């Protein structure tokens, strides 16, 4: 054919806005999909975007044509602060250099090794202390979980953890929570279409920008301090390593290693390494309370494999297929980043029988893959069996793509999985979960869905086992 995937006819500037509900972008797009097919074109305001629904379409593009779909598209709210700098929301050589450096440096600081495993186990011990500190009282688990998760990536990028009582630490965590929420609201999704006008208007979006600026200012301040105390021969953290590279690249006019990329890359890792794992833990505990039978089976496995005294360790996962299936099912059901981070084609592309001109933005609908009816028997239910065969052994799925896939896939995946396993296992070894309401009445549908999937606010109690 040589034409763009088909889709609803757009109007000048507003695009397909009148055919979408900003409060329910995923549903709006899936509905349109029913009429046009799994691969179609939508206009988010002036942004022409090719939407990919279901496993095959997503894998065929992002993996079978990985290089062609390896460009980074827009996320207007994050782009407000990043402006094309840093490692996530950037493109070309800049992204390429920053990604190679970040992965190497994260490994240098223990990621994927015993070094970060020990860091996570230690922070998990501090979480257990904090939960015991509540005395079994009903509490909002939100910041208990985020403080613990954030301290892992914080020890890597800033060299030391934050004290749980540090008020500024709480403030940064509120900024992250607030920005993920804003991007998942109707206004945050309206912003994705009309940022050209909205970035200049009063409104909720301005408060969101101020939370991003607050996070940026905090990182700039930390960088300054490291700068004046830096030992080129003994880096303390991610920031020092980057400062050293900047030093070594000072004679290169075209280097990507300069202050703005240092600040933005560090900001990407601080927010990235915090909010998504935190949200997943929070959703996870809610699902476990909605499903006591699953919690009960987790406890049998933990007591048998690990016991009551030693701390869980990452190698324990190989002997714990049920917990591994449970964590996969939480990520599959949570669908935390439902439309991934937009990609864009690097050059003119032929995909299936369509034509995608260079620069065209792409929405890989991860959530449509995680709930693909050809890969999961009951996609709309929380059921760990989705990841187990008949002998209760762990069974992988090609449709398990919460970290996306391809050339710009999440390089925080190994760290995330290690955190999820050790935090879920250590909490559940130590506590049984008590909801403030009957399981039948627990509502696990999300509170907001847009850029992220946000669970409803809730309180619960952690009772020692
Ligand atoms: C449950 C946790 C997490 C989920 C579900 C998740 C998900 C994702 C997704 C869907 C993307 C976009 C991938 C693409 O464009 O194809 C992404 C990218 C990225 N993630 Fe994560 N992530 C998680 C944790 C983390 C953590 C802990 C870190 C940090 C160490 C991190 C760092 C990044 C970075 C730097 C990128 C951008 C990669 C690039 O542009 O080349 N993520 N993540
Ligand atoms: C890190 N993973 C979770 C991908 C992801 C979702 C949202 C963001 C993110 C948002 C602001 C700054 N840096 C990164 O990054």
mmCIF file of C-alpha atoms in Angstrom, residues 47-223:
data_model
loop_
_atom_site.group_PDB
_atom_site.id
_atom_site.type_symbol
_atom_site.label_atom_id
_atom_site.label_comp_id
_atom_site.label_asym_id
_atom_site.label_seq_id
_atom_site.Cartn_x
_atom_site.Cartn_y
_atom_site.Cartn_z
ATOM 1 C CA UNK A 47 1.130 14.650 17.150
ATOM 2 C CA UNK A 48 0.636 11.874 14.506
ATOM 3 C CA UNK A 49 1.131 8.637 16.323
ATOM 4 C CA UNK A 50 0.998 5.003 15.159
ATOM 5 C CA UNK A 51 -0.598 2.880 17.902
ATOM 6 C CA UNK A 52 0.480 -0.809 18.237
ATOM 7 C CA UNK A 53 -2.039 -3.096 20.037
ATOM 8 C CA UNK A 54 -1.497 -6.687 21.115
ATOM 9 C CA UNK A 55 1.571 -8.851 21.360
ATOM 10 C CA UNK A 56 2.333 -9.556 17.735
ATOM 11 C CA UNK A 57 2.131 -5.987 16.509
ATOM 12 C CA UNK A 58 4.275 -4.770 19.426
ATOM 13 C CA UNK A 59 6.941 -7.484 19.145
ATOM 14 C CA UNK A 60 7.076 -7.267 15.349
ATOM 15 C CA UNK A 61 7.878 -3.570 15.538
ATOM 16 C CA UNK A 62 10.018 -3.165 18.621
ATOM 17 C CA UNK A 63 11.926 -6.444 18.200
ATOM 18 C CA UNK A 64 11.688 -7.666 14.552
ATOM 19 C CA UNK A 65 12.345 -4.097 13.368
ATOM 20 C CA UNK A 66 14.223 -3.013 16.557
ATOM 21 C CA UNK A 67 16.555 -0.507 14.915
ATOM 22 C CA UNK A 68 13.754 1.130 12.875
ATOM 23 C CA UNK A 69 11.580 1.554 15.986
ATOM 24 C CA UNK A 70 14.451 2.564 18.255
ATOM 25 C CA UNK A 71 13.779 6.295 18.220
ATOM 26 C CA UNK A 72 12.373 8.035 21.362
ATOM 27 C CA UNK A 73 9.042 9.806 21.045
ATOM 28 C CA UNK A 74 7.552 12.568 23.230
ATOM 29 C CA UNK A 75 6.180 12.619 26.790
ATOM 30 C CA UNK A 76 5.233 16.290 26.986
ATOM 31 C CA UNK A 77 5.147 16.660 30.725
ATOM 32 C CA UNK A 78 8.644 15.143 31.216
ATOM 33 C CA UNK A 79 9.964 16.909 28.117
ATOM 34 C CA UNK A 80 9.102 20.232 29.812
ATOM 35 C CA UNK A 81 12.059 19.766 32.175
ATOM 36 C CA UNK A 82 14.268 17.446 30.113
ATOM 37 C CA UNK A 83 14.157 19.268 26.833
ATOM 38 C CA UNK A 84 15.869 16.473 24.905
ATOM 39 C CA UNK A 85 18.742 16.075 27.452
ATOM 40 C CA UNK A 86 19.562 13.159 29.749
ATOM 41 C CA UNK A 87 19.258 9.452 28.894
ATOM 42 C CA UNK A 88 15.521 8.622 28.726
ATOM 43 C CA UNK A 89 13.833 11.410 26.852
ATOM 44 C CA UNK A 90 16.522 11.907 24.293
ATOM 45 C CA UNK A 91 17.624 10.694 20.917
ATOM 46 C CA UNK A 92 20.468 9.768 18.619
ATOM 47 C CA UNK A 93 24.129 9.993 19.682
ATOM 48 C CA UNK A 94 23.199 11.723 22.936
ATOM 49 C CA UNK A 95 20.938 8.841 24.041
ATOM 50 C CA UNK A 96 23.441 6.290 22.737
ATOM 51 C CA UNK A 97 26.421 7.689 24.715
ATOM 52 C CA UNK A 98 24.425 8.339 27.903
ATOM 53 C CA UNK A 99 22.837 4.890 27.850
ATOM 54 C CA UNK A 100 26.145 3.052 27.385
ATOM 55 C CA UNK A 101 27.737 5.077 30.179
ATOM 56 C CA UNK A 102 24.779 4.670 32.543
ATOM 57 C CA UNK A 103 24.544 0.918 32.157
ATOM 58 C CA UNK A 104 28.300 0.555 32.692
ATOM 59 C CA UNK A 105 28.355 2.856 35.680
ATOM 60 C CA UNK A 106 25.349 1.212 37.307
ATOM 61 C CA UNK A 107 27.182 -2.157 36.954
ATOM 62 C CA UNK A 108 30.309 -0.555 38.402
ATOM 63 C CA UNK A 109 28.259 0.408 41.453
ATOM 64 C CA UNK A 110 26.986 -3.111 42.029
ATOM 65 C CA UNK A 111 23.889 -3.377 39.872
ATOM 66 C CA UNK A 112 23.446 -7.008 38.885
ATOM 67 C CA UNK A 113 25.990 -8.082 41.510
ATOM 68 C CA UNK A 114 26.372 -9.011 45.180
ATOM 69 C CA UNK A 115 27.103 -5.342 45.915
ATOM 70 C CA UNK A 116 23.630 -4.047 45.159
ATOM 71 C CA UNK A 117 21.999 -7.248 46.457
ATOM 72 C CA UNK A 118 23.514 -6.504 49.867
ATOM 73 C CA UNK A 119 22.338 -2.873 49.599
ATOM 74 C CA UNK A 120 18.758 -4.008 48.854
ATOM 75 C CA UNK A 121 18.794 -6.586 51.663
ATOM 76 C CA UNK A 122 20.029 -3.953 54.103
ATOM 77 C CA UNK A 123 17.375 -1.411 53.022
ATOM 78 C CA UNK A 124 14.760 -4.164 53.173
ATOM 79 C CA UNK A 125 15.822 -4.744 56.792
ATOM 80 C CA UNK A 126 15.202 -0.997 57.418
ATOM 81 C CA UNK A 127 11.728 -1.318 55.861
ATOM 82 C CA UNK A 128 10.964 -4.259 58.255
ATOM 83 C CA UNK A 129 12.138 -2.130 61.189
ATOM 84 C CA UNK A 130 9.826 0.721 59.988
ATOM 85 C CA UNK A 131 6.833 -1.600 59.587
ATOM 86 C CA UNK A 132 7.407 -3.098 63.072
ATOM 87 C CA UNK A 133 7.663 0.506 64.270
ATOM 88 C CA UNK A 134 3.953 0.990 63.332
ATOM 89 C CA UNK A 135 2.906 -1.550 65.988
ATOM 90 C CA UNK A 136 0.351 -3.227 63.725
ATOM 91 C CA UNK A 137 -1.521 0.062 63.309
ATOM 92 C CA UNK A 138 -3.500 0.881 60.206
ATOM 93 C CA UNK A 139 -1.263 3.061 57.988
ATOM 94 C CA UNK A 140 -0.897 4.368 54.433
ATOM 95 C CA UNK A 141 1.980 2.200 53.106
ATOM 96 C CA UNK A 142 2.799 4.712 50.338
ATOM 97 C CA UNK A 143 5.855 6.485 51.722
ATOM 98 C CA UNK A 144 7.049 3.561 53.790
ATOM 99 C CA UNK A 145 7.518 1.743 50.479
ATOM 100 C CA UNK A 146 8.829 4.679 48.481
ATOM 101 C CA UNK A 147 11.418 5.712 51.044
ATOM 102 C CA UNK A 148 12.857 2.105 51.006
ATOM 103 C CA UNK A 149 12.875 1.806 47.164
ATOM 104 C CA UNK A 150 14.311 5.292 46.639
ATOM 105 C CA UNK A 151 17.169 4.671 49.028
ATOM 106 C CA UNK A 152 18.556 1.891 46.791
ATOM 107 C CA UNK A 153 19.036 4.046 43.699
ATOM 108 C CA UNK A 154 19.912 7.013 45.972
ATOM 109 C CA UNK A 155 22.895 5.091 47.440
ATOM 110 C CA UNK A 156 24.106 4.561 43.886
ATOM 111 C CA UNK A 157 23.671 8.044 42.425
ATOM 112 C CA UNK A 158 24.332 10.116 45.584
ATOM 113 C CA UNK A 159 26.605 7.741 47.459
ATOM 114 C CA UNK A 160 24.586 7.464 50.671
ATOM 115 C CA UNK A 161 21.008 6.747 51.719
ATOM 116 C CA UNK A 162 18.565 9.312 53.090
ATOM 117 C CA UNK A 163 17.456 9.082 56.769
ATOM 118 C CA UNK A 164 13.742 8.006 56.855
ATOM 119 C CA UNK A 165 13.004 11.078 59.033
ATOM 120 C CA UNK A 166 14.646 13.499 56.529
ATOM 121 C CA UNK A 167 11.825 15.971 55.696
ATOM 122 C CA UNK A 168 13.402 17.064 52.380
ATOM 123 C CA UNK A 169 13.530 13.327 51.386
ATOM 124 C CA UNK A 170 9.734 13.132 51.983
ATOM 125 C CA UNK A 171 9.304 16.297 49.944
ATOM 126 C CA UNK A 172 11.166 14.789 46.930
ATOM 127 C CA UNK A 173 9.081 11.622 47.187
ATOM 128 C CA UNK A 174 5.886 13.719 47.164
ATOM 129 C CA UNK A 175 7.122 15.470 44.034
ATOM 130 C CA UNK A 176 7.648 12.121 42.255
ATOM 131 C CA UNK A 177 4.267 10.779 43.349
ATOM 132 C CA UNK A 178 2.635 14.009 42.290
ATOM 133 C CA UNK A 179 4.221 14.036 38.836
ATOM 134 C CA UNK A 180 3.249 10.407 38.117
ATOM 135 C CA UNK A 181 -0.267 11.146 39.227
ATOM 136 C CA UNK A 182 -0.609 14.322 37.133
ATOM 137 C CA UNK A 183 0.526 12.449 33.989
ATOM 138 C CA UNK A 184 -2.099 9.800 34.611
ATOM 139 C CA UNK A 185 -4.991 12.306 34.946
ATOM 140 C CA UNK A 186 -7.280 13.722 32.238
ATOM 141 C CA UNK A 187 -5.410 17.057 32.375
ATOM 142 C CA UNK A 188 -2.023 15.323 32.099
ATOM 143 C CA UNK A 189 -3.249 13.472 28.975
ATOM 144 C CA UNK A 190 -4.782 16.678 27.578
ATOM 145 C CA UNK A 191 -1.347 18.185 28.070
ATOM 146 C CA UNK A 192 0.143 15.465 25.814
ATOM 147 C CA UNK A 193 -2.003 16.931 22.985
ATOM 148 C CA UNK A 194 -1.945 20.665 23.730
ATOM 149 C CA UNK A 195 1.316 21.378 25.531
ATOM 150 C CA UNK A 196 2.012 24.053 22.852
ATOM 151 C CA UNK A 197 -0.662 26.168 24.482
ATOM 152 C CA UNK A 198 -1.000 24.673 27.962
ATOM 153 C CA UNK A 199 2.649 25.046 28.991
ATOM 154 C CA UNK A 200 1.915 28.835 28.923
ATOM 155 C CA UNK A 201 -1.456 28.638 30.784
ATOM 156 C CA UNK A 202 -2.276 28.572 34.453
ATOM 157 C CA UNK A 203 -3.567 25.212 35.616
ATOM 158 C CA UNK A 204 -2.593 21.834 37.221
ATOM 159 C CA UNK A 205 0.134 21.463 34.670
ATOM 160 C CA UNK A 206 1.998 24.445 36.230
ATOM 161 C CA UNK A 207 2.036 22.697 39.645
ATOM 162 C CA UNK A 208 3.366 19.589 37.920
ATOM 163 C CA UNK A 209 6.182 21.651 36.329
ATOM 164 C CA UNK A 210 7.077 23.020 39.727
ATOM 165 C CA UNK A 211 7.451 19.454 41.123
ATOM 166 C CA UNK A 212 9.850 18.608 38.232
ATOM 167 C CA UNK A 213 11.772 21.851 38.862
ATOM 168 C CA UNK A 214 11.988 20.988 42.581
ATOM 169 C CA UNK A 215 13.528 17.613 41.664
ATOM 170 C CA UNK A 216 15.916 19.203 39.164
ATOM 171 C CA UNK A 217 17.061 21.823 41.710
ATOM 172 C CA UNK A 218 17.738 19.116 44.271
ATOM 173 C CA UNK A 219 19.915 17.185 41.787
ATOM 174 C CA UNK A 220 21.762 20.392 40.707
ATOM 175 C CA UNK A 221 22.523 21.131 44.353
ATOM 176 C CA UNK A 222 23.870 17.582 44.958
ATOM 177 C CA UNK A 223 26.010 17.793 41.834
#
